[PDB]
Amino acid sequence: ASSVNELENWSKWMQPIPDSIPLARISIPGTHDSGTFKLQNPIKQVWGMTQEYDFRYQMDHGARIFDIRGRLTDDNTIVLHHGPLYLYVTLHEFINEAKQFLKDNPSETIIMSLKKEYEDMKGAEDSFSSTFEKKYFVDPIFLKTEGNIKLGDARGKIVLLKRYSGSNEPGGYNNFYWPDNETFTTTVNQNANVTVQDKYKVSYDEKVKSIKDTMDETMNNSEDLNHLYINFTSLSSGGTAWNSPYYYASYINPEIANYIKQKNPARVGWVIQDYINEKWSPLLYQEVIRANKSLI
Numbered sequence: 001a002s003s004v005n006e007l008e009n010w011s012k013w014m015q016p017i018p019d020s021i022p023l024a025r026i027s028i029p030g031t032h033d034s035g036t037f038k039l040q041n042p043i044k045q046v047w048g049m050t051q052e053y054d055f056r057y058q059m060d061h062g063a064r065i066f067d068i069r070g071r072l073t074d075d076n077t078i079v080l081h082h083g084p085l086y087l088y089v090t091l092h093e094f095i096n097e098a099k100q101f102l103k104d105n106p107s108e109t110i111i112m113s114l115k116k117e118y119e120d121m122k123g124a125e126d127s128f129s130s131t132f133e134k135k136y137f138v139d140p141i142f143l144k145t146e147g148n149i150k151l152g153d154a155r156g157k158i159v160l161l162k163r164y165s166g167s168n169e170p171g172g173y174n175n176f177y178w179p180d181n182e183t184f185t186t187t188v189n190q191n192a193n194v195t196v197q198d199k200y201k202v203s204y205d206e207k208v209k210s211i212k213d214t215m216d217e218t219m220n221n222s223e224d225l226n227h228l229y230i231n232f233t234s235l236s237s238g239g240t241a242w243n244s245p246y247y248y249a250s251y252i253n254p255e256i257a258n259y260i261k262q263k264n265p266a267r268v269g270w271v272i273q274d275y276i277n278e279k280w281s282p283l284l285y286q287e288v289i290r291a292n293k294s295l296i
């Protein structure tokens with residue numbers, strides 16, 4: 001319908017947005033290293049954990065972009081990893097949560113970014129991209145439409161954001177040059193541009209400025225429908241309680257949340273964050289979702 005109050009239902013917040021709006025133009029909360037929630041070993045948690053809750057908790061809190069990092073096993077299935085570590089979560093496991101969620105909330109869409117996080121186990125029969133495409137993508141939940149995907153065509157389906165090469169099947173967002181630890185801008189699909197801020201290995205200070213500056217560039221280019229803006233608030237670092245992603249996010253999330261709160265912008269972009277929870281105020285994911293009041 002037509003009320004900003006509808007953006008307040010985290011489970012169906014995309015319901016009020018017009019079908020004609022390109023997904024790119026929508027401000028969307030996302031989660032970084034989404035599948036790390038099962039990590040229980042203290043040392044592993046410090047070095048790799050970025051989320052405390054599962055996929056379903058994540059989507060019921062408004063997150064629509066999932067950063068999935070896989071690895072081809074001998075058994076010829078794709079499981080989730082954080083570098084060399086297996087996360088006790090599988091790709092099927094993710095797809096099924098997304099399927100259930102999209103069934104209960106058919107107004108929504110889920111964007112799934114897929115990246116090959118580690119090298120294929122030695123005995124696999126096919127390549128990573130090939131297994132993914134013949135064994136999973138082929139599933140009807142995957143949108144096979146490319147171009148500047150519109151919200152209308154996406155609802156009820158999972159939209160792929162390829163972060164792997166060798167893709168032979170058309171659909172979703174195509175792979176694009178993604179340089180290490182920087183903020184950049186290039187082109188995707190056919191004519192659309194993309195600017196990404198992914199300075200994952202920098203100082204806190206440099207990070208907050210990188211986020212704000214990319215966010216500024218976004219709110220100032222609010223009507224450029226064919227421009228993707230992906231902005232990672234996540235930052236990784238050393239191995240101690242005052243250096244871990246949890247420590248940083250406990251600062252970065254409320255800081256960016258308020259930053260959006262006060263600027264009252266029309267466009268915020270795709271904001272991928274660590275630790276989507278309900279501890280810090282204001283809520284980053286909620287402020288990002290509210291920057292959509294202008295589309296209603």
Ligand SMILES: N[C@H]1[C@@H](O[C@H]2[C@H](O)[C@H](O)[C@H](O)[C@@H](O)[C@@H]2O)O[C@H](CO)[C@@H](O)[C@@H]1O
Nearest residue numbers: 032033083179180181198200232234236
């Ligand atoms: N960790 C490997 C990975 O880096 C990741 C970051 O860790 C972080 O999660 C970021 O948000 C991702 O976008 C980024 O891709 O990919 C690089 C490819 O150049 C490798 O060299 C690195 O060692």
